[PDB]
Ligand binder design. Structure first.
Ligand code: CL
Ligand code: CL
Length: 524
């Protein structure tokens, strides 16, 4: 019983099986300075850890039990995988394609292989004969984690990356800064972490829930950030940092109130509540602009991927309205609409980025509500993450020639409850965002062919207002993460929730072996 998730574009089962011994020979293309050989070496280590099988090299076709060949006609993440009694044959055009072919290969084996866990007893190992041709539907297949509200740390984020890689996801969006915490070391502004990474409650207060008096927090050093980026790159996951400015910035304001606060004479502390804060950055202060530039500079050094997310939330303008510098700047830009200050701030930063050498330039991503503002000055070389009225907003973005990513609150905010049972952990929602609901979302329903090139893909987002424990994070992430991964990867014509349900059931064993929690509703 073969169970592949995401389901490949094309799968044909054939007669017989390929058997591994304790040792066998592989021939691997030397394409791009042995890059594919490096991918294969990582695979060899994983295989040996789980099965004891050792692979050696050959240059002879006739002696190669496994062969990785270059086929330049295939798309950048595409592959062919042909398993017969005599040979495993893989073709791809790019490293990621070889990597994905090998992920599929592992998935055809017992779940302990994908889990990277050995059996205690002697086992023998084989693959079903198959012909697979596969390629992702979308180039952006993403997961966002909020570590601003609750910090999980390096080991847990490595596990998150591990989960993503199993399901061939390729974009990790790291929501690192918030009203309630700042989680990334910035060398020029050390108080962002010293002040902003710690606060006097673990829980975030809302309604009947009050602050709990626990001194709580944490942050990533730059060394940690580089380590995680490198770890993710080995699994073909690129990382997008999100540093929210000037909204969702209360932690930064608490760190440097003397120039970031609109009201510096007032007390500023890290927020212990859930909600929307009015304590926004004073975008009219020249030192605040210097700060934003210096933060972007440091992000460029740490994150090699070509995008930065700056938020674009419709932050409260109340404090700007009461600030002499902000009132003066608004008058100077010839406006009476304070939202124009936020857009002006972004334009400044976009212009600054454009002054940098090409390799240091980054494209900006914003949440779709930014488009409610007067955004003409930003041009159309921005990317829109569509989360609220997502289908309508994505269409609007595409009509303006902006690339767009679909992350609808309903149903891709997978921190939301996944069941109506009274025993579920506390999180947002009422229990309607079941695995079925997540899977059934159709990203290109009713999207005109002309607009489709702008739709880069899909992303599940995980907000952590309520989620304080890794066990709960995992419980909510899985298995809905796989449903979104399948939406991202599998052609529409091969998608079917009932079929997915049967396949994803096979991964309970994987999750158990890895020690991951998961929702049990569709399992067993
Ligand atoms: Cl679909
Ligand atoms: Cl669709």
């Amino acid at each position: 019983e073969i169970a592949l998730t995401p389901q490949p574009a094309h799968l044909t089962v054939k007669d017989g099986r390929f058997e591994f011994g304790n040792q066998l020979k592989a021939k691997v293309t030397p394409y791009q300075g042995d890059s594919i050989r490096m991918v294969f070496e990582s695979f060899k280590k994983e295989l040996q850890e789980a099965t004891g099988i050792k692979v050696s090299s050959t240059q002879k076709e006739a002696k190669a039990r496994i062969i990785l060949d270059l086929n330049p006609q295939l798309p950048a993440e595409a592959y062919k995988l042909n398993v017969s009694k005599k040979q495993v044959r893989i073709e791809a055009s790019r490293p990621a394609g070889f990597y994905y072919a090998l992920q599929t290969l592992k998935q055809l084996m017992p779940r302990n292989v994908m889990a990277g866990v050995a059996t205690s007893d002697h086992s023998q190992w084989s693959l079903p004969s198959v012909e697979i041709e596969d390629a992702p539907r979308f180039e952006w297949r993403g997961f966002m984690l909020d570590e601003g509200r609750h910090f999980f740390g390096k080991d847990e984020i490595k596990r998150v990356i591990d989960m993503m890689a199993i399901y061939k996801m390729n974009r990790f969006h790291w929501h690192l800064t918030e009203d309630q915490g700042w989680r990334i070391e910035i060398k020029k502004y050390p108080k962002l972490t010293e002040t902003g990474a710690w606060r006097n409650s673990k829980v975030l207060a809302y309604g009947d829930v009050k602050p709990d008096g626990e001194r709580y927090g944490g942050f990533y050093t730059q060394k940690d950030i580089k380590e995680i980026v490198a770890y993710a790159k080995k699994k073909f996951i690129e990382i997008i940092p999100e540093i929210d400015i000037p909204g969702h910035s209360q932690a930064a304001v608490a760190a440097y109130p003397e120039f970031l606060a609109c009201d510096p004479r007032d007390k500023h502390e890290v927020w212990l509540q859930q909600g929307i804060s009015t304590d926004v950055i004073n975008v009219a202060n020249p030192k605040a602009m210097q700060f934003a530039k210096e933060v972007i500079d440091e992000l460029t050094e740490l994150f090699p991927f070509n995008y930065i997310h700056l938020g674009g939330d419709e932050c409260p303008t109340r404090k700007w309205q009461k600030n002499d510098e902000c009132k003066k700047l608004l008058s100077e830009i010839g406006s009476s609409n304070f939202r124009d200050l936020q857009i002006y701030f972004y334009k400044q930063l976009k212009d600054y980025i454009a002054t940098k050498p090409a390799d240091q330039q980054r494209q900006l991503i914003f949440w779709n509500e930014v488009l409610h503002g007067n955004t003409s000055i930003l041009g159309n070389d921005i990317t829109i993450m569509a989360w609220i009225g997502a289908n309508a907003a994505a269409k609007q973005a595409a009509k303006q020639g902006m690339n767009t990513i679909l992350s609808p609150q309903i149903p891709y905010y997978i921190n939301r409850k996944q069941s109506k049972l009274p025993t579920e952990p506390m999180s947002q929602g009422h229990g309607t965002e079941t695995v079925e609901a997540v899977y059934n979302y159709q990203p290109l329903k009713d999207v005109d062919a002309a607009l489709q090139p702008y739709y880069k893909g899909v992303q599940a987002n995980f907000w952590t207002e309520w989620v304080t424990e890794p066990s709960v994070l995992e419980y909510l992430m899985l298995p809905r993460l796989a449903a979104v991964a399948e939406a991202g990867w599998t052609p529409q014509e091969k998608r079917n929730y009932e079929d997915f349900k049967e396949r994803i059931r096979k991964d309970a064993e994987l999750y158990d072996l890895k020690g991951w929690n998961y929702g049990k509703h569709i399992m067993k």
